[PDB]
Amino acid sequence: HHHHH
Amino acid sequence: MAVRLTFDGQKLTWPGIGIFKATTGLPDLQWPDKQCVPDAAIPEGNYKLFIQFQGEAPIRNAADCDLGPSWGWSTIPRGQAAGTCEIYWANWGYNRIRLESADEKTRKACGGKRGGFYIHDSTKGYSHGCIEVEPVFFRILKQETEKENGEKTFTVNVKYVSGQQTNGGTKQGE
Ligand code: MED
């Protein structure tokens, strides 16, 4: 994923 | 309407209207020469904006405070509605618009290893590999688009003409 949040 | 925004690391320009303060990259990564480092200044090139308003952003994992991806203009759960995720989602802000690389040079930037780009209206003075913009941008976007009837096409060209820090002073002041 490009982001974790 | 057809709008080609431009972003130079410090200002997001809407031709014919005005300029918005804008910032890209985490605090130590706000540099054009770091644009292929994860979470740094967004890579130069051409991106499509997804401005279709789709309401609240999907939540991929509430337990991990992880928003899902979405291709549109969505809102961020905040305050009590965000629970313990507030501190993390304050880094999103209240609004986000998805970006997608729109041509060959942009898709191939950085070996194709970066992505997940958005324009968003947090007031941190940094961005996790996206573009943080002055919140009024989203008020102008709503007002300008809701008075037109036909198709609405938005893009942004990212081009760094200076090596200066890619911080437009978006941190909340006074
Ligand atoms: C896992 S892709 C790298 C992280 C993403 N936020 C970016 O800046 O491109």
Residue numbers in the entry:
A (entry chain B): 702 to 706
B (entry chain A): 2 to 175
Sentences from the paper on this structure:
One such T6SS effector is Tlde1a from Salmonella Typhimurium. Tlde1a functions as an LD-carboxypeptidase to cleave tetrapeptide stems and as an LD-transpeptidase to exchange the terminal D-alanine of a tetrapeptide stem with a noncanonical D-amino acid. Our structural data revealed that Tlde1a possesses a unique LD-transpeptidase fold consisting of a dual pocket active site with a capping subdomain. This includes an exchange pocket to bind a D-amino acid for exchange and a catalytic pocket to position the D-alanine of a tetrapeptide stem for cleavage.
To probe the molecular features of Tlde1a that may contribute to this activity, we soaked Tlde1a crystals with D-Ala and D-Met. We were able to obtain cocrystal structures of Tlde1a in complex with each amino acid. The interaction of both D-amino acids with Tlde1a is facilitated by a salt bridge between the D-amino acid carboxylic acid and the sidechain of R115. Interestingly, the hydrophobic sidechain of D-Met faces toward the solvent and has no significant interaction with the active site of Tlde1a. Although the His-tag is an artifact, binding of the known D-Met substrate to Tlde1a induces a drastic conformational change in the His-tag. Compared to the native and D-Ala–bound structures, the His-tag in the D-Met–bound structure has significantly shifted its position within the Tlde1a active site. This change also includes the ability to model five His-tag residues instead of four and the loss of two ordered sulfates. Additionally, the binding of D-Met and the reordering of the His-tag induces a conformational change in the Tlde1a capping subdomain relative to both the sulfate and D-Ala–bound structures. Given the observed His-tag peptide bound in the active site of Tlde1a and that both the artifact and the capping subdomain change conformation upon binding of D-Met, we hypothesize that like YcbB the capping subdomain of Tlde1a stabilizes a peptide stem for transpeptidase exchange activity and potentially for crosslinking.
